[PDB]
């Protein structure tokens, strides 16, 4: 006759996580590496998005 | 959100490469715009294509950019050749999606392209 012994399944090989990096670099060098910095009363805030 | 774009290659001056606004599906439009900005100067215009067929270019980019629209993959492709170091910038694709009669372009997405010999 024909008998069913066990069940077979394929196991995942490697786990992969990805979120979208998709963007531009980011305006940081112009802040930290800037040649000159603003005074403590004419305040320079740069927007980052 | 909705749409998206990335990619691009860094190349030497005098090269040729194809900027592509990677498609996000079928979207209603009448004007596709390639636009460029570099730090330290006013954000400037590159070229607009029109669904009707009109094509407009900036004064400083004659003979070096070719704009084309592909309606199957609904993407605009800019073939750029004869490059000089004043193209070092990040390039954005502004849409035209009719909002109340036009507006709200999706130029949030950018592609950083710097042309340099080293
Ligand atoms: C995201 O991808 C772009 C090009 O695909 C690359 O220039 C950038 O460095 C990437 N971001 C990170 C954090 O790796
Ligand atoms: C500032 O510039 C120098 C040389 O260009 C570089 O070595 C340094 O890493 C930069 N600063 C930061 C925070 O990356």
Our measurement of the distance from residue B94's CA atom to the centroid of its chain's CA atoms, rounded to an integer in Å, reads: 8
Q: What is the resolution of this structure in A?
A: 3.4
Taking the C-alpha atoms of residue B81 and residue B66, their distance in angstroms, rounded to an integer, is 9
3-state percent helix, strand, coil for chain B, nearest multiple of 5? 5, 40, 55
Q: Do A25 and B39 touch (CB under 8 A)?
A: no
Q: Closest by alpha carbon to B48, among B30, B63, B71?
A: B30
Taking the C-alpha atoms of residue B118 and residue B65, their distance in angstroms, rounded to an integer, is 23
Taking the C-alpha atoms of residue A33 and residue A49, their distance in angstroms, rounded to an integer, is 19
Taking the C-alpha atoms of residue A23 and residue A21, their distance in angstroms, rounded to an integer, is 6
Query: Which atom of ligand 1 lies nearest, measured to the CA of B6?
Result: 5
Which contiguous run of DSSP H or E holds residue A31?
helix A29-32
> What are the DSSP E strand ranges found in chain B?
17-20, 31-37, 44-50, 55-57, 65-70, 75-80, 89-94, 110-113
Phi-psi region for residue A31, left (φ > 0), alpha (ψ -120 to 50) or beta?
alpha
Q: Closest by alpha carbon to B116, among B8, B10, B35?
A: B10
Q: Closest by alpha carbon to B20, among B87, B70, B88, B83?
A: B70
Chain A CB contacts of B39 below 8 Å: 27, 30
Taking the C-alpha atoms of residue B76 and residue B20, their distance in angstroms, rounded to an integer, is 6
C-alpha distances in Å from residue B13, one per residue of A15, B64, B89, B116, B118:
41, 12, 13, 6, 10
Bridge partners (DSSP) listed for residue B31: B50
Distance B114 CA to ligand 1 centre (A): 14
Q: What one-character DSSP code corresponds to residue B79?
A: E
């Amino acid at each position: 006759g024909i008998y069913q012994t066990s069940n077979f399944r394929v196991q995942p090989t490697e786990s992969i996580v990805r979120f979208p990096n998709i963007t531009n670099l980011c305006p940081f060098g112009e802040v930290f590496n800037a040649t000159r910095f603003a005074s403590v009363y004419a305040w320079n805030r740069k927007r980052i998005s | 959100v909705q749409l998206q774009e990335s990619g691009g290659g860094l190349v030497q001056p005098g090269g040729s490469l194809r900027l592509s606004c990677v498609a996000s599906g079928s979207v209603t439009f009448n004007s596709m715009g390639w636009y460029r900005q570099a730090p330290g100067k006013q954000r400037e215009l590159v070229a607009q294509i029109t669904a009707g067929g009109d094509t407009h270019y900036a004064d400083s980019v004659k003979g070096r950019f070719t704009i084309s629209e592909h309606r199957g993959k609904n993407a605009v492709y800019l073939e750029m050749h004869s490059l000089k170091p004043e193209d070092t910038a990040v390039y954005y694709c502004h849409l035209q999606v009719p909002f109340l009669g036009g507006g709200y372009d999706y130029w949030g997405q950018g592609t950083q392209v710097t042309v340099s010999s080293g």
